[PDB]
Design a protein around this ligand. Structure first.
Ligand code: A1JGU
Ligand code: A1JGU
Lengths: 302, 301
């Protein structure tokens, strides 16, 4: 029993984190085989960051202008190039701890583990979701840039996030490992803001299914609803629409608990309209939306 | 900025996890140098649960009755003994991935990371506290026994918890790495039950200081309190007493925010009386008590 915000074990990713310095800027990189991946803004100073021309800044740098440290050891940079908003530094030595991996782009609502690092040194791990507005609610100070997010899908690490920056509201923006931003952001010091966010409906239902499995039942009722009726209610409460794909995806949990998705939607309907009337669910007074269906199945079976 | 329940990177501990089998019972063990530590109930059968005589069960075992598997590889057990409620199995190979480590027994209120494991293979990592009633609120299925809790407060791993069992209320009980239980619990299936839990006052205050640091001020007031009056009120909401040790410990957060501890105590009284009236604090609609003073300093500045 018990239900907790749970991260993947971080060990395979710890053995890829390195420090990258360019000028007075130090941040984190990811060392896989003989390439180190990091945000391209490592090459910018304060003035440059205001309105950078990355192409122009890069061609002015020799290999030896990138200092790369793995633990106490220096790595020799032998080549450098750019892919979207990530810098790829070719190094002389392949990473002996390189795990089996892939680069994947995740969808809003999907979750992942973040290994926060400072000076190439991992400091903490936590679980995050990609919000509908393409931000993450992370925990990051200065020096965290280049920290990465991932899932482990077998023995294979799926890298999905590299941290670039913090927005003025204290939430976080970054890229996939091919350097494409999540959300309408750019790597420069200009005025940017998170769009208004919504709740991830399908995840809330998954978390309701988790609460049932752990013996929390008070919000079940005799009622059921349709997709459309429920969606009229969701839109009103700033919840994402629920689709047939969502319902299919919840099938396993529905079967295991004998609560049909639309029946559970009837419970969620009521919680939205009436509130929690003093009660909590899995220790929370708010509806949690940062666990996927798969996350629930994984923690309540695997 | 932001504020998150953050666990330590788990890799130094992943490198120490092994599978231990005795009869039909499989659970997790911790391989450090040439010793594997696991719960002693690995040697108990269907019968043994209610009233196990561990000394009697153990004397009947040889080394080769313990199968230990680290990844693909079997380790040869060359010795065994019992220390309190943990079995220590001597093996033929020192763990090459043994980190710098120590064993520490923690106090109620202290936090630590758990590596949940099944069949000696790590499954997930999360952050926990030792509750006042000496239980932890974890996430643990069958086969999780022998999973461990730890801190890493430099390059040194401090092992502080080994998981033994689930109580009927769905919370969790275990030992330090010298095999002494936290709380009055025993590795026996008798009726036993967690004492009523209280909130960890010192941690809630630390978390209030964290919300101030991150720019959140709405819950302060112009009042102060004595320590004693604060404790008389807190007890009525099932909060742990705050002691002078607690107050001293919060000094650095007090200095960093310019708010005296007893002033912050006044704010907590008011929050208990009023609740939050639709507001959140660092994203919570409840008062969080699973961050220590040390944890706040570590994540914030
Ligand atoms: C200013 C710069 C930047 C601006 C725009 C685009 C890219 C970079 N940086 C650098 C830095 O370290 N962080 C940061 C990241 N996370 C948490 C915190 Br607090 C700070 C930034 O936002
Ligand atoms: C029955 C036995 C035991 C009882 C009392 C004392 C010692 C052992 N086990 C074995 C087992 O795996 N767990 C367990 C641990 N965490 C979560 C869950 Br669900 C189950 C137990 O309580």
């Amino acid at each position: 029993s018990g239900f907790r915000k749970m991260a993947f074990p971080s060990g395979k990713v710890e053995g890829c984190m390195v420090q990258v310095t360019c000028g007075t800027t130090t941040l984190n990189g990811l060392w896989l085989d003989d390439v180190v991946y990091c945000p391209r803004h490592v090459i910018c100073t304060s003035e440059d960051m205001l309105n950078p021309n990355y192409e122009d800044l890069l061609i002015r740098k020799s290999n030896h202008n990138f200092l790369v440290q793995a633990g106490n050891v220096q790595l020799r940079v032998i080549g450098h190039s750019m892919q979207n908003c990530v810098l790829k530094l070719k190094v002389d030595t392949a990473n002996p701890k390189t795990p089996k991996y892939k680069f994947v782009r995740i969808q809003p609502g999907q979750t992942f583990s973040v290994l926060a690092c400072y000076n190439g040194s991992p400091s903490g791990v936590y679980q995050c979701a990609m919000r509908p507005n393409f931000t993450i609610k992370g925990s990051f100070l200065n020096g965290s840039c280049g920290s990465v997010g991932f899932n482990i899908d077998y023995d294979c690490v799926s890298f999905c996030y590299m941290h670039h920056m913090e927005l003025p509201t204290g939430v976080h923006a970054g890229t996939d490992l091919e350097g494409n931003f999540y959300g309408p952001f750019v790597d420069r010091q200009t005025a940017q803001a998170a769009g208004t966010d919504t709740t991830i409906t399908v995840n809330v239902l998954a978390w309701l299914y988790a609460a049932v499995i752990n013996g929390d039942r008070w919000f079940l009722n005799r009622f059921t609803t349709t997709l459309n009726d429920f969606n009229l209610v969701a839109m009103k409460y700033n919840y994402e629409p629920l689709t047939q794909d969502h319902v299919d995806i919840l099938g396993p949990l529905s079967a295991q608990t004998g609560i049909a998705v639309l029946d559970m939607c009837a419970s969620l309907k009521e919680l939205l309209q009436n509130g929690m009337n003093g009660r909590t669910i899995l220790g929370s007074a708010l509806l949690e939306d940062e666990f996927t269906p798969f996350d629930v199945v994984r923690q309540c079976s695997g």
